[PDB]
Amino acid sequence: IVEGSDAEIGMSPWQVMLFRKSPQELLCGASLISDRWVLTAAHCLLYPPWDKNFTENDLLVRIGKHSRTRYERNIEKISMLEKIYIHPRYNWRENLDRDIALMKLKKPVAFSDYIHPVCLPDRETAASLLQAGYKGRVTGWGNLKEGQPSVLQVVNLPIVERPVCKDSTRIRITDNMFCAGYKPDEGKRGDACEGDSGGPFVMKSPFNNRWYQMGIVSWGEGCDRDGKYGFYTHVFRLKKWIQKVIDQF
């Protein structure tokens, strides 16, 4: 995260770190949506242009974390994956349309002060909250600029109007994406960066005071560049697929 701040303890108890087993390293962000299901970006797992294709046994999920590098004894929990599910119409070839994946854990994680699931939106919350100018929150252990943070970073960013999103890029934007960030003359700054991919964009509903994950960090050209915006997978638009997987698995 660029131009973010250190998270508070327990501020994002749904944050998940996707961790490469060998060599050990951050791969991506992710989110906890139940005691056995983890949500991430498809490109974190499958991106043939970069020879990326991970299988279950390649990875660990680390939940409850704050420090990036440290092993947080008696706090984080580390989980193995039972099965990865990538959207069947994920478009890695062109623009990362439908950039979404689920991971099924081998065993349920115990919830704690530091470990708790986020909600996924219903149609009515999505309609109410996904509006230009409304702010969400992005969290992650990725780059601080286009070093790496000691602890989880947080930044609040406004949703941008669809024509501004489209006019900022040569990439074809779809209905399964939205973009967020400040415009050059808004003063404030901030963005996701490498390593933050697959983590959540969340919003706090003013109707029931619960946090909802509206987006998944998906792609951006550079990090925190003026006139550019970060793109996020639109979680509500892909909810049928999520439900079908959880229902069928």
Binding site: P117, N156, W211
Partner: peptide, 28 residues
Amino acid sequence: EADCGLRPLFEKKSLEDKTERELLESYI
């Protein structure tokens, strides 16, 4: 999840984090 989106160290204790009100104020 019945209890989703309610954080033990914040909503469950009626404690606010330092920037959530920036979000509420944008929901105009």
